[PDB]
Amino acid sequence: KEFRLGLITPSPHTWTKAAEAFGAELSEKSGGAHSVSVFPARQLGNEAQMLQQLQTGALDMAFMTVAEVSNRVPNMGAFYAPYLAGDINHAAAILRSDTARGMLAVLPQEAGVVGVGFGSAGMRQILSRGAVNSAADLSGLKLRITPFDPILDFYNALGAAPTPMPLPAVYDALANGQVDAIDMDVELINVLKCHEHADTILISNHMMFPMVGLISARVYAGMSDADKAMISELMAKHVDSTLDVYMVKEPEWTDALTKVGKTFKRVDQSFFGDAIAQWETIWADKAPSLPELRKTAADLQAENLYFQ
């Protein structure tokens, strides 16, 4: 079978490279019986469209933001609690936990997909065209976000003017004033060069940004038992590999952003004032897994169960 795998990330992106590597290994491990054609950069549609077609089985596979999945499955919102993870190594440990993996079990019924495991991209940061000395400076700023509710809620609590926008439009929107600021990670701030029309880079690490490897449940059901096991395990390995890339590269991409001539500041949870508490109130009855995920995150940190 020639499977198709969609992503929204550009070609240089870690996810796209991981999907290509998965595709190569599947071809080899299957003795050429199967192949994967990778379609990055939104070639097959936006993420919402891709999920619709995973659900029907018109699309076989995706490396998808958990952000999009949360639009369909609001419990995935739990991963976006601000400052749940203290850094990318903590985030990776959370995403590998039994608590997190247990949350995947609902996906075949609730979204028509099998989730094999979690990967991630980088922590979320803020880039702005003007000075930002306190959270009050975010008030009324047209601020680009990924189109999902957890981040919309965070910025609405802060009083910004969040504006959903997909990746390809972001650079131009900054350059032309359609937005004043963006929510982004350091990999894409580097790759998309969004720092070019920014004044201030705020390294806030305010939210994690998980990824999930998905197989259409309709397609999975048509696979032989041997292939269900082999393909899901292999995909899980490649999804998991992204966590180690970000563990290594996150501080490297961050340091590169000290060399682009802009005002560079690190801020912590206190910077955001009451927005974190407001977010909790919004999400308490939307994402029932949140208390258990918070306990898991706290235990990983207390036990020093990651590189820190």
mmCIF file of C-alpha atoms in Angstrom:
data_model
loop_
_atom_site.group_PDB
_atom_site.id
_atom_site.type_symbol
_atom_site.label_atom_id
_atom_site.label_comp_id
_atom_site.label_asym_id
_atom_site.label_seq_id
_atom_site.Cartn_x
_atom_site.Cartn_y
_atom_site.Cartn_z
ATOM 1 C CA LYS A 1 0.000 0.000 0.000
ATOM 2 C CA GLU A 2 1.146 3.528 -0.827
ATOM 3 C CA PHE A 3 0.117 5.508 2.210
ATOM 4 C CA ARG A 4 -0.118 9.294 2.231
ATOM 5 C CA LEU A 5 1.009 11.305 5.250
ATOM 6 C CA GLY A 6 0.143 14.981 5.644
ATOM 7 C CA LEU A 7 1.676 17.760 7.721
ATOM 8 C CA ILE A 8 1.357 21.564 7.891
ATOM 9 C CA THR A 9 5.036 22.128 8.601
ATOM 10 C CA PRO A 10 7.521 23.411 6.042
ATOM 11 C CA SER A 11 10.172 21.170 4.536
ATOM 12 C CA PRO A 12 13.061 22.133 6.874
ATOM 13 C CA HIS A 13 10.937 21.493 9.948
ATOM 14 C CA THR A 14 11.837 18.725 12.379
ATOM 15 C CA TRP A 15 8.422 17.067 11.916
ATOM 16 C CA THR A 16 8.778 16.895 8.158
ATOM 17 C CA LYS A 17 12.206 15.326 8.458
ATOM 18 C CA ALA A 18 10.843 12.774 10.948
ATOM 19 C CA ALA A 19 7.974 11.886 8.584
ATOM 20 C CA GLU A 20 10.400 11.391 5.712
ATOM 21 C CA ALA A 21 12.571 9.186 7.947
ATOM 22 C CA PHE A 22 9.483 7.173 8.986
ATOM 23 C CA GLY A 23 8.576 6.758 5.316
ATOM 24 C CA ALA A 24 12.026 5.513 4.424
ATOM 25 C CA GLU A 25 12.116 3.016 7.280
ATOM 26 C CA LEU A 26 8.632 1.703 6.499
ATOM 27 C CA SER A 27 9.641 1.005 2.921
ATOM 28 C CA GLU A 28 12.698 -0.892 4.144
ATOM 29 C CA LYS A 29 11.062 -2.781 6.968
ATOM 30 C CA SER A 30 8.222 -3.880 4.725
ATOM 31 C CA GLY A 31 10.562 -5.119 1.981
ATOM 32 C CA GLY A 32 8.933 -2.610 -0.364
ATOM 33 C CA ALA A 33 5.377 -3.863 0.260
ATOM 34 C CA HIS A 34 4.427 -0.448 1.648
ATOM 35 C CA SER A 35 5.549 3.104 1.040
ATOM 36 C CA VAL A 36 4.684 6.531 2.410
ATOM 37 C CA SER A 37 4.341 9.671 0.355
ATOM 38 C CA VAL A 38 4.853 12.708 2.559
ATOM 39 C CA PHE A 39 2.935 15.911 1.866
ATOM 40 C CA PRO A 40 4.258 18.717 4.038
ATOM 41 C CA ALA A 41 3.489 22.428 4.041
ATOM 42 C CA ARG A 42 -0.328 22.109 4.003
ATOM 43 C CA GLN A 43 -0.251 20.605 0.505
ATOM 44 C CA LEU A 44 -3.294 18.452 1.332
ATOM 45 C CA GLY A 45 -5.254 21.186 3.091
ATOM 46 C CA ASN A 46 -5.284 22.758 6.506
ATOM 47 C CA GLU A 47 -5.032 20.679 9.639
ATOM 48 C CA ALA A 48 -8.786 20.660 10.239
ATOM 49 C CA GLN A 49 -9.339 19.384 6.702
ATOM 50 C CA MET A 50 -6.658 16.764 7.154
ATOM 51 C CA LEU A 51 -8.324 15.527 10.325
ATOM 52 C CA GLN A 52 -11.664 15.276 8.490
ATOM 53 C CA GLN A 53 -10.046 13.123 5.892
ATOM 54 C CA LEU A 54 -8.218 10.978 8.389
ATOM 55 C CA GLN A 55 -11.644 10.397 9.841
ATOM 56 C CA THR A 56 -13.079 9.186 6.539
ATOM 57 C CA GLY A 57 -9.887 7.435 5.548
ATOM 58 C CA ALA A 58 -9.310 9.534 2.432
ATOM 59 C CA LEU A 59 -6.015 10.459 4.143
ATOM 60 C CA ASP A 60 -4.055 7.608 5.735
ATOM 61 C CA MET A 61 -1.684 9.307 8.184
ATOM 62 C CA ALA A 62 -0.545 12.636 9.605
ATOM 63 C CA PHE A 63 1.953 14.146 11.986
ATOM 64 C CA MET A 64 -0.547 16.593 13.470
ATOM 65 C CA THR A 65 -0.569 19.261 16.085
ATOM 66 C CA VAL A 66 -2.391 18.164 19.189
ATOM 67 C CA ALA A 67 -3.726 21.724 18.899
ATOM 68 C CA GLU A 68 -5.954 20.777 15.987
ATOM 69 C CA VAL A 69 -6.957 17.529 17.646
ATOM 70 C CA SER A 70 -8.111 19.569 20.679
ATOM 71 C CA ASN A 71 -10.682 21.320 18.486
ATOM 72 C CA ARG A 72 -12.262 17.877 18.084
ATOM 73 C CA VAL A 73 -11.295 16.413 21.475
ATOM 74 C CA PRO A 74 -11.275 19.149 24.115
ATOM 75 C CA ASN A 75 -9.595 17.009 26.760
ATOM 76 C CA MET A 76 -6.389 17.408 24.735
ATOM 77 C CA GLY A 77 -6.614 21.017 25.963
ATOM 78 C CA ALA A 78 -5.104 19.778 29.235
ATOM 79 C CA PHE A 79 -1.615 19.729 27.718
ATOM 80 C CA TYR A 80 -1.744 23.499 27.197
ATOM 81 C CA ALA A 81 -2.094 24.567 30.799
ATOM 82 C CA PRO A 82 0.329 27.490 31.042
ATOM 83 C CA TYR A 83 3.616 26.512 32.693
ATOM 84 C CA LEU A 84 2.586 22.894 33.132
ATOM 85 C CA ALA A 85 6.113 22.148 31.924
ATOM 86 C CA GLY A 86 9.068 24.115 33.164
ATOM 87 C CA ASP A 87 11.067 23.507 29.989
ATOM 88 C CA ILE A 88 11.242 21.239 26.991
ATOM 89 C CA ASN A 89 12.859 18.335 28.890
ATOM 90 C CA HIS A 90 10.056 18.395 31.434
ATOM 91 C CA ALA A 91 7.528 18.548 28.564
ATOM 92 C CA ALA A 92 9.022 15.481 26.889
ATOM 93 C CA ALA A 93 8.818 13.550 30.148
ATOM 94 C CA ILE A 94 5.160 14.556 30.535
ATOM 95 C CA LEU A 95 4.356 13.491 26.993
ATOM 96 C CA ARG A 96 5.949 10.066 27.559
ATOM 97 C CA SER A 97 4.074 9.478 30.821
ATOM 98 C CA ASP A 98 1.379 6.874 31.310
ATOM 99 C CA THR A 99 -1.073 9.669 32.065
ATOM 100 C CA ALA A 100 -0.477 11.306 28.717
ATOM 101 C CA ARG A 101 -0.463 8.054 26.753
ATOM 102 C CA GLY A 102 -3.694 6.991 28.398
ATOM 103 C CA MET A 103 -5.381 10.053 26.890
ATOM 104 C CA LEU A 104 -4.787 8.621 23.392
ATOM 105 C CA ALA A 105 -7.263 5.803 23.972
ATOM 106 C CA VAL A 106 -10.292 7.954 23.145
ATOM 107 C CA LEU A 107 -9.115 8.963 19.693
ATOM 108 C CA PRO A 108 -10.572 6.147 17.587
ATOM 109 C CA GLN A 109 -14.113 6.865 18.762
ATOM 110 C CA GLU A 110 -13.864 10.615 19.304
ATOM 111 C CA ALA A 111 -11.805 11.509 16.224
ATOM 112 C CA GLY A 112 -11.679 8.430 13.989
ATOM 113 C CA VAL A 113 -7.937 8.119 14.372
ATOM 114 C CA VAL A 114 -5.380 5.946 16.139
ATOM 115 C CA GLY A 115 -2.796 8.018 17.953
ATOM 116 C CA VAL A 116 0.448 6.092 18.223
ATOM 117 C CA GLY A 117 2.286 8.364 20.605
ATOM 118 C CA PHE A 118 3.243 11.981 21.225
ATOM 119 C CA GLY A 119 6.011 14.117 19.853
ATOM 120 C CA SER A 120 6.359 17.857 20.217
ATOM 121 C CA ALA A 121 7.543 21.053 18.727
ATOM 122 C CA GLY A 122 9.122 23.800 20.788
ATOM 123 C CA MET A 123 7.730 25.735 23.682
ATOM 124 C CA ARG A 124 5.627 28.767 22.833
ATOM 125 C CA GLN A 125 7.219 32.199 22.822
ATOM 126 C CA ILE A 126 6.109 35.751 21.940
ATOM 127 C CA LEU A 127 7.541 38.088 19.286
ATOM 128 C CA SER A 128 6.290 41.675 19.084
ATOM 129 C CA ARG A 129 6.781 44.675 16.789
ATOM 130 C CA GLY A 130 6.988 47.110 19.682
ATOM 131 C CA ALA A 131 8.483 47.171 23.170
ATOM 132 C CA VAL A 132 7.133 44.732 25.748
ATOM 133 C CA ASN A 133 8.044 45.524 29.327
ATOM 134 C CA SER A 134 5.050 43.998 31.057
ATOM 135 C CA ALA A 135 1.947 42.017 30.246
ATOM 136 C CA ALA A 136 -0.009 45.291 30.039
ATOM 137 C CA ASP A 137 1.928 46.001 26.825
ATOM 138 C CA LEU A 138 0.125 43.028 25.210
ATOM 139 C CA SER A 139 -3.269 44.657 25.739
ATOM 140 C CA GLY A 140 -5.059 45.197 22.443
ATOM 141 C CA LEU A 141 -2.169 43.820 20.359
ATOM 142 C CA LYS A 142 -3.287 41.950 17.268
ATOM 143 C CA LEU A 143 -1.409 38.763 18.033
ATOM 144 C CA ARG A 144 -1.138 35.764 15.721
ATOM 145 C CA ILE A 145 -2.126 32.411 17.154
ATOM 146 C CA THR A 146 -2.476 28.819 16.062
ATOM 147 C CA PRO A 147 -6.213 28.216 15.497
ATOM 148 C CA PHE A 148 -7.172 26.428 18.714
ATOM 149 C CA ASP A 149 -8.972 27.405 21.871
ATOM 150 C CA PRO A 150 -6.389 26.926 24.621
ATOM 151 C CA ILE A 151 -4.105 29.652 23.269
ATOM 152 C CA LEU A 152 -7.034 31.890 22.327
ATOM 153 C CA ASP A 153 -8.165 31.711 25.923
ATOM 154 C CA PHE A 154 -4.700 32.550 27.327
ATOM 155 C CA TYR A 155 -4.431 35.645 25.146
ATOM 156 C CA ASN A 156 -8.009 36.720 25.789
ATOM 157 C CA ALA A 157 -7.287 36.524 29.529
ATOM 158 C CA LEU A 158 -4.282 38.744 28.900
ATOM 159 C CA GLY A 159 -6.427 41.169 26.954
ATOM 160 C CA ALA A 160 -4.503 40.830 23.696
ATOM 161 C CA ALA A 161 -6.401 40.610 20.375
ATOM 162 C CA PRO A 162 -5.541 37.082 19.245
ATOM 163 C CA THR A 163 -5.928 36.420 15.566
ATOM 164 C CA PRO A 164 -5.772 32.878 14.150
ATOM 165 C CA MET A 165 -3.484 32.494 11.186
ATOM 166 C CA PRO A 166 -1.701 29.592 9.575
ATOM 167 C CA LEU A 167 2.083 29.504 9.248
ATOM 168 C CA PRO A 168 2.537 30.661 5.618
ATOM 169 C CA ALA A 169 0.850 34.029 6.250
ATOM 170 C CA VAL A 170 2.690 35.008 9.428
ATOM 171 C CA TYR A 171 5.889 36.601 8.055
ATOM 172 C CA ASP A 172 3.937 38.850 5.695
ATOM 173 C CA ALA A 173 1.380 39.777 8.362
ATOM 174 C CA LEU A 174 4.159 41.069 10.576
ATOM 175 C CA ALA A 175 5.889 42.863 7.713
ATOM 176 C CA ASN A 176 2.662 44.562 6.627
ATOM 177 C CA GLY A 177 1.062 45.311 10.002
ATOM 178 C CA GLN A 178 -1.838 42.852 9.839
ATOM 179 C CA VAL A 179 -0.525 41.681 13.225
ATOM 180 C CA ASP A 180 1.544 43.444 15.884
ATOM 181 C CA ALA A 181 2.862 40.286 17.550
ATOM 182 C CA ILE A 182 2.936 36.515 17.206
ATOM 183 C CA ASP A 183 2.838 33.397 19.314
ATOM 184 C CA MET A 184 5.462 31.034 17.881
ATOM 185 C CA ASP A 185 8.330 28.710 18.810
ATOM 186 C CA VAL A 186 12.025 29.339 18.293
ATOM 187 C CA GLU A 187 12.457 26.811 15.490
ATOM 188 C CA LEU A 188 9.927 28.595 13.308
ATOM 189 C CA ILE A 189 10.966 32.090 14.358
ATOM 190 C CA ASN A 190 14.352 31.071 12.924
ATOM 191 C CA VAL A 191 13.056 29.164 9.887
ATOM 192 C CA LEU A 192 10.338 31.632 8.859
ATOM 193 C CA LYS A 193 12.555 34.600 9.762
ATOM 194 C CA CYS A 194 9.745 36.284 11.667
ATOM 195 C CA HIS A 195 12.282 38.169 13.800
ATOM 196 C CA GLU A 196 13.052 40.411 10.835
ATOM 197 C CA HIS A 197 10.158 42.821 11.532
ATOM 198 C CA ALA A 198 10.007 42.249 15.281
ATOM 199 C CA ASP A 199 11.381 44.638 17.894
ATOM 200 C CA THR A 200 11.203 42.294 20.898
ATOM 201 C CA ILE A 201 11.649 38.576 21.380
ATOM 202 C CA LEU A 202 10.127 37.309 24.604
ATOM 203 C CA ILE A 203 11.334 33.879 25.643
ATOM 204 C CA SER A 204 8.437 32.975 27.895
ATOM 205 C CA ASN A 205 8.154 29.218 27.392
ATOM 206 C CA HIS A 206 4.543 29.647 28.444
ATOM 207 C CA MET A 207 2.957 26.551 26.877
ATOM 208 C CA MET A 208 4.063 23.255 25.398
ATOM 209 C CA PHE A 209 3.028 22.257 21.893
ATOM 210 C CA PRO A 210 2.602 18.508 21.447
ATOM 211 C CA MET A 211 2.354 16.568 18.228
ATOM 212 C CA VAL A 212 0.619 13.268 17.609
ATOM 213 C CA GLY A 213 1.208 10.632 14.970
ATOM 214 C CA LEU A 214 -2.157 9.616 13.567
ATOM 215 C CA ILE A 215 -3.401 6.748 11.454
ATOM 216 C CA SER A 216 -6.942 6.880 10.098
ATOM 217 C CA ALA A 217 -8.923 4.334 12.119
ATOM 218 C CA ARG A 218 -10.692 3.202 8.923
ATOM 219 C CA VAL A 219 -7.308 2.535 7.306
ATOM 220 C CA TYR A 220 -5.819 0.923 10.435
ATOM 221 C CA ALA A 221 -8.779 -1.467 10.546
ATOM 222 C CA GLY A 222 -7.953 -2.656 7.026
ATOM 223 C CA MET A 223 -4.356 -3.538 7.906
ATOM 224 C CA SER A 224 -3.212 -7.053 8.700
ATOM 225 C CA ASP A 225 -2.595 -7.706 12.377
ATOM 226 C CA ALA A 226 1.158 -7.838 11.770
ATOM 227 C CA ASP A 227 1.086 -4.535 9.966
ATOM 228 C CA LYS A 228 -1.053 -2.826 12.626
ATOM 229 C CA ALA A 229 1.679 -3.659 15.094
ATOM 230 C CA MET A 230 4.680 -2.964 12.920
ATOM 231 C CA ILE A 231 3.420 0.277 11.417
ATOM 232 C CA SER A 232 2.108 1.728 14.646
ATOM 233 C CA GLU A 233 5.335 0.845 16.557
ATOM 234 C CA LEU A 234 7.508 2.297 13.814
ATOM 235 C CA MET A 235 5.483 5.500 13.618
ATOM 236 C CA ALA A 236 5.617 5.802 17.412
ATOM 237 C CA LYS A 237 9.401 5.559 17.292
ATOM 238 C CA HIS A 238 9.675 8.374 14.782
ATOM 239 C CA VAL A 239 7.146 10.568 16.601
ATOM 240 C CA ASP A 240 9.022 10.029 19.851
ATOM 241 C CA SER A 241 12.319 10.925 18.139
ATOM 242 C CA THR A 242 11.141 14.510 17.757
ATOM 243 C CA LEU A 243 11.227 14.936 21.529
ATOM 244 C CA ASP A 244 14.978 14.317 21.566
ATOM 245 C CA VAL A 245 15.514 16.768 18.703
ATOM 246 C CA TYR A 246 13.791 19.555 20.661
ATOM 247 C CA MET A 247 15.577 18.610 23.880
ATOM 248 C CA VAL A 248 18.870 19.219 22.065
ATOM 249 C CA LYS A 249 17.982 22.070 19.715
ATOM 250 C CA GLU A 250 15.607 24.288 21.699
ATOM 251 C CA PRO A 251 18.413 26.145 23.513
ATOM 252 C CA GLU A 252 20.458 26.277 20.293
ATOM 253 C CA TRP A 253 17.628 27.935 18.326
ATOM 254 C CA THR A 254 17.013 30.224 21.293
ATOM 255 C CA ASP A 255 20.628 31.336 21.425
ATOM 256 C CA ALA A 256 20.542 32.001 17.668
ATOM 257 C CA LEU A 257 17.810 34.555 18.366
ATOM 258 C CA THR A 258 20.253 36.579 20.500
ATOM 259 C CA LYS A 259 22.159 37.211 17.263
ATOM 260 C CA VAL A 260 19.491 38.910 15.147
ATOM 261 C CA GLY A 261 19.864 42.410 16.552
ATOM 262 C CA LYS A 262 16.636 42.547 18.540
ATOM 263 C CA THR A 263 15.599 43.157 22.123
ATOM 264 C CA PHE A 264 15.734 39.727 23.730
ATOM 265 C CA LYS A 265 14.203 39.039 27.143
ATOM 266 C CA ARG A 266 13.400 35.974 29.217
ATOM 267 C CA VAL A 267 10.288 36.097 31.348
ATOM 268 C CA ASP A 268 8.626 33.684 33.703
ATOM 269 C CA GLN A 269 5.154 32.798 34.880
ATOM 270 C CA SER A 270 4.842 35.919 37.051
ATOM 271 C CA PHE A 271 4.948 38.060 33.931
ATOM 272 C CA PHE A 272 1.457 36.896 32.972
ATOM 273 C CA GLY A 273 -0.333 37.881 36.179
ATOM 274 C CA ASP A 274 -3.865 36.560 36.571
ATOM 275 C CA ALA A 275 -4.116 35.090 33.058
ATOM 276 C CA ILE A 276 -2.913 31.693 34.223
ATOM 277 C CA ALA A 277 -5.566 31.490 36.946
ATOM 278 C CA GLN A 278 -8.251 32.586 34.495
ATOM 279 C CA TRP A 279 -7.167 29.873 32.068
ATOM 280 C CA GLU A 280 -7.580 27.234 34.788
ATOM 281 C CA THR A 281 -11.120 28.408 35.489
ATOM 282 C CA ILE A 282 -12.001 28.171 31.800
ATOM 283 C CA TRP A 283 -10.516 24.708 31.354
ATOM 284 C CA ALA A 284 -11.519 22.997 34.634
ATOM 285 C CA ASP A 285 -14.704 21.540 33.164
ATOM 286 C CA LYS A 286 -13.474 21.197 29.569
ATOM 287 C CA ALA A 287 -10.438 18.967 30.160
ATOM 288 C CA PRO A 288 -11.110 16.448 32.975
ATOM 289 C CA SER A 289 -7.576 15.038 32.658
ATOM 290 C CA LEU A 290 -6.001 18.269 33.854
ATOM 291 C CA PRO A 291 -5.671 17.456 37.568
ATOM 292 C CA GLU A 292 -4.016 14.107 36.866
ATOM 293 C CA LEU A 293 -1.682 15.654 34.285
ATOM 294 C CA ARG A 294 -0.703 18.366 36.755
ATOM 295 C CA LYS A 295 0.106 15.699 39.374
ATOM 296 C CA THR A 296 2.174 13.778 36.861
ATOM 297 C CA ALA A 297 4.084 16.900 35.856
ATOM 298 C CA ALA A 298 4.715 17.781 39.496
ATOM 299 C CA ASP A 299 5.947 14.293 40.356
ATOM 300 C CA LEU A 300 8.359 14.222 37.407
ATOM 301 C CA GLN A 301 9.854 17.493 38.560
ATOM 302 C CA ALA A 302 10.022 16.541 42.224
ATOM 303 C CA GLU A 303 11.731 13.244 41.403
ATOM 304 C CA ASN A 304 14.158 14.887 38.931
ATOM 305 C CA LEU A 305 13.144 12.454 36.192
ATOM 306 C CA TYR A 306 14.537 14.414 33.256
ATOM 307 C CA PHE A 307 17.598 16.441 32.306
ATOM 308 C CA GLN A 308 17.597 19.696 34.289
#
